[PDB]
């Protein structure tokens, strides 16, 4: 079963996902639609090709032609932001599903709020120095994080991590945090993050220097 | 009626795998089916197997040689082994079984992270992030394998909470951090601890995040 990989459209406009099969399996047999929300198990949404469970809006509907099926779901809102996936019935009566669709929800652009966090005196003391940088509830995903070091381009020493489109605004955040020993971390002074993205006019950068702070 | 599955979150390759799933509300004999479904990380859902209403057993082709389910009555469970694990077979795992009709939703278990690795179980160290918005959090660092779980104030505090994906270091350890957005006015008189979970290694933490003493 073949379904693309991703869907999207704005707030309150209509989505469909298509499941493509054989004549051996959605040909034959039913089929069944679920929601796979972040961290969640699936939620069937429809069974046997266009009913739904109890508890199931009709927002969601499902349809079935020859070899392929049809999701589809209207009214879309943030809570909609899923991975949704289709599944039947193999030759041998076995269960088999689709690859699965993201479904993204289109809203108007965000522009990152950016927090910086020295390493704590805590953690220095364990001989290293994660340095990390906050962008907070934006859209787009796209965003680029650039690390400077007493104006040195980092490359290579810092990782991302990105959330899923929030369950109440549909935005993202992503928190990048840079690695060093903590003797390079006590090398230098000006530690900086600079963001650059659509809903800002130019690039926003936070920085603070080695020494302005004490734990608490 | 509620389905829990348990085991092991790391297994050695070659070795077994053993998950049992709990089943609460509902009678073990009395179900249409019971079965289990995987999902690697970023993937899609694999169908393993299932155990019939007779006892009667039906598995994957591709995985018929290494896996057993069977039910125990007694205990009202019933369980997966999946023996000769590869890193191929990490994956979420899910019990999930029909009860009541035909087309009742099937209920499904919260799905249980197995990671097969031959690198050993590290508990993580936990380090404040610490601060009209304020941002703080907690970076959870260099722990194996996946997951840790992360609340805020025991579970009140969610809103603007933001808890990101694990990054795997280039060392082979995981490192998360979770975040939290508050009114600024609020960090003189609000107690904030983030409550960490590393289940693998049976580390808890409860780590109180208090502003830094800082002169910029």
């Known amino acids: 079963l073949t379904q693309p990989p991703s869907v999207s459209a704005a707030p309150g406009q209509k989505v469909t996902i298509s499941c493509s099969g054989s004549?051996?399996?959605?040909?034959?047999?039913?089929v069944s639609w679920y929601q796979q929300l972040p961290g969640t198990a699936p939620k069937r949404l429809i069974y046997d090709n266009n009913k739904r469970p109890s508890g199931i809006p009709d927002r969601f509907s499902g349809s079935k032609s020859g070899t392929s099926a049809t999701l589809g779901i209207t009214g879309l809102q943030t809570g909609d932001e899923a991975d949704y996936y289709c599944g039947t019935w193999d030759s041998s009566l076995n269960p088999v599903f689709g690859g699965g669709t993201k479904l993204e929800i289109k809203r108007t652009v965000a522009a990152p709020s950016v927090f910086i966090f020295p390493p704590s005196d805590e953690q220095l003391k364990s001989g290293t120095a994660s340095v990390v940088c906050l962008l907070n509830n934006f859209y787009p995903r796209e965003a680029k994080v650039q690390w400077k070091v007493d104006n040195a381009l980092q490359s290579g020493n810092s990782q991302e991590s990105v959330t899923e489109q929030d369950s109440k605004d549909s935005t993202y955040s992503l928190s990048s945090t840079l690695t060093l020993s903590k003797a390079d971390y006590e090398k230098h002074k000006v530690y900086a993050c600079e963001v650059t993205h659509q809903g800002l006019s130019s690039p926003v950068t936070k920085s603070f220097n080695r020494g302005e702070c004490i734990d608490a | 009626v509620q389905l829990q599955e348990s085991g092991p979150g790391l297994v050695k390759p070659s070795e077994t795998l053993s998950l049992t799933c709990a089943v609460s509300?509902?009678?073990?004999?009395?179900?249409?089916?019971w079965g289990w479904i995987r999902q690697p990380p970023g993937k899609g859902l694999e169908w393993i197997g299932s155990?019939?209403?007779?006892?009667?057993?039906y598995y994957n082709p591709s995985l018929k040689s290494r896996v057993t389910i069977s039910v125990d009555t007694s205990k009202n469970q019933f369980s997966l082994k999946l023996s000769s694990v590869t890193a191929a077979d990490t994956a979420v795992y899910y019990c999930?079984?029909?009860?009541?009709?035909?087309?009742?939703?099937?209920?499904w278990g919260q799905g249980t992270l197995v990671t097969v690795s031959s690198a050993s179980t590290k508990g993580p160290s936990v380090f404040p992030l610490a601060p009209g918005t304020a941002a703080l959090g907690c970076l959870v660092k260099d722990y194996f394998p996946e997951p840790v779980t992360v609340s805020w104030n025991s579970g009140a505090l969610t809103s603007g909470v933001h808890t990101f994906p694990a990054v795997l270091q280039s060392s082979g350890l995981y490192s998360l951090s979770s975040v939290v957005t508050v009114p600024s006015s609020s960090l003189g008189t609000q107690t904030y601890i983030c409550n960490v979970n590393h289940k693998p290694s049976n580390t808890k933490v409860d780590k109180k995040v208090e502003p830094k003493s800082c002169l910029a």
């Open positions: 509300g509902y009678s073990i004999s009395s179900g249409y089916y």
């Open positions: 155990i019939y209403h007779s006892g009667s057993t």
């Open positions: 004549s051996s399996n959605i040909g034959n047999n039913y």
């Open positions: 999930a079984g029909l009860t009541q009709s035909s087309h009742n939703d099937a209920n």
